Structures are given as C-alpha cells and as structure tokens.
C-alpha cells in the first residue's frame, strides 16, 4: 500500500468573515455572488483562482453601506489553478 495526503488541493471562498453577515438584494441577487461572476468573467483568462478571489476581496475594501469582507479559507492548493477559458 501507498500513502497519500488526506486533505490537499482545496480552496474555499466565503461571502463574509467569521461572525459576520453577507448581503443579498431581494431582486438583484447576492452581492458576493454577483461580484464573483463579474470577476471570473473578466479575469479567468489571465489570473489563477486565488488571484481572482483576492480581486473580489479588494472590491469590498471600502466598507460603504452594507459592509462585508469575503474570505478565502482552508487553502491546500499546491499549484496555480488557471481555468484556461476557451481551452
């Protein structure tokens, strides 16, 4: 028999920091989800997912109005994950 890591190549991206609320407009949808789609649409071509997720976090920087801060959690990605859209 051979050994393998029990937990590897994971990344979680949550809409807010622990203890804290995430926001959802009743007709426009969840802000984090909307922001995530827009950044994936634009940056999947040139950035790995960790970089995209950081860009999403940056967009929430200013705590204007309904403040929230998306978080990357429990990361065991050993390589860069590029989506290579089109390929």
């Amino acid at each position: 028999i051979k050994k393998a890591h029990i937990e590897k190549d994971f990344i979680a991206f949550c809409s807010s920091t622990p203890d804290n609320v995430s926001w959802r407009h009743p007709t426009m949808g969840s802000v984090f989800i909307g922001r995530l789609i827009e950044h994936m649409q634009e940056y999947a071509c040139s950035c790995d997912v960790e970089e995209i997720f950081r860009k999403v976090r940056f967009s929430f920087e200013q705590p204007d109005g309904r403040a929230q801060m998306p978080t990357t959690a429990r990361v065991t990605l050993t390589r860069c994950f590029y989506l290579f859209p089109g390929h």
Binding site: I6, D9, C14
Partner: protein, 163 residues
C-alpha cells in the same frame, strides 16, 4: 459570458506550478450548486434565482456540467455530496466546483429545517471531509473549489471610529 484565454495568453502562462488541464474532447467536468430558498423558520431568500442563474451559466461556460439541487436539509445535502463525490466522471475530470447558497450561522450552512430550537446545519468541516482523498479518491491531486454565499453569524462585521 467569460473572456477567453487566447493561444498566446495560454503560452505566456505555460510552468510546473500549474494544475494540469485535461483534453477538452475527452474530459467530463462536474460542478454542483446547492441553493436553499425556502425555509421552515427563516424568511424566503428572495433573489436566489438570480444567483442560481448567474452561477450555472458561468460554470457551464467554464466547461462544467452543472447539477442544481434546491431546498434541502443538512442530511439531504450530505447525501447529495456523497453521491457527487462518487460520480465516475470525476476520474475523467481535472477539477470541480461546489457552490452552497443559503442562510448561515457561525457553526455552518443552514438546512431548510433550521431553527434556534432545532439546528439543521451542514458544517464546513463535513464538506471538506466528504470531498477529501479518502471519500473522494477520484479528485485526488485535482483542485476542488468551494464557494459559499451565507452569513457566518449575525454581526454587521464593523467597528466605529471618530478619528
């Protein structure tokens, strides 16, 4: 809906620090969206359909076959995740996406029957466990992306200052 990575862009990115991508013609990429909109003791998550639409379209355009499940208890979510992890398509896949959208508390994601009296919670810990190398060997060495839209507690998450 996604900006495409051109041939010269993919060459610019390509060395040994990147997850290998499977051939487009032979690969069977899978993704799962679990979204709870209706609850026993929590107000309807109005606008969730906008989230479902956007995420489904995005993931399909990224090359994933997307399965959508709606209004489940933590137990049903668990069963679904167990079935998803055992899907043979993962063996001919290079990656996966798991999207969870629901009400949430610090402990985790809310099932459709959640109450302060009777908790119905899927823990983040359990999600990782069900998709790890033991329980999902077909995704060993392959990136697993978990996306969560939920509260992580009821605090506005702010601090006030004068100066």
């Amino acid at each position: 809906n996604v900006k495409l990575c051109s041939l010269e862009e993919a060459q610019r990115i390509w060395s040994a620090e990147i997850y290998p991508i499977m051939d487009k013609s032979s690969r069977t990429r899978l993704a799962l969206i679990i979204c709870n909109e209706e609850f026993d003791s929590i107000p309807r998550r109005t606008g969730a359909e906008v989230d479902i639409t956007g995420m489904t379209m995005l993931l399909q355009n990224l090359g994933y076959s997307v399965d959508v499940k709606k209004n489940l208890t933590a137990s049903d979510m668990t069963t679904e995740l167990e079935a998803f992890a055992h899907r043979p398509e993962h063996k001919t896949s290079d990656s996966t996406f798991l999207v969870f959208m629901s009400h949430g508390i610090r402990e985790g994601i809310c099932g459709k029957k959640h109450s302060e009296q009777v908790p119905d919670i899927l823990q983040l810990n359990a999600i990782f466990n069900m998709l790890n190398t033991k329980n999902c060997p077909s995704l060993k060495d392959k990136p697993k992306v978990i996306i969560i839209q939920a509260c992580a507690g009821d605090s506005p998450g702010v601090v006030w200052f004068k100066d």
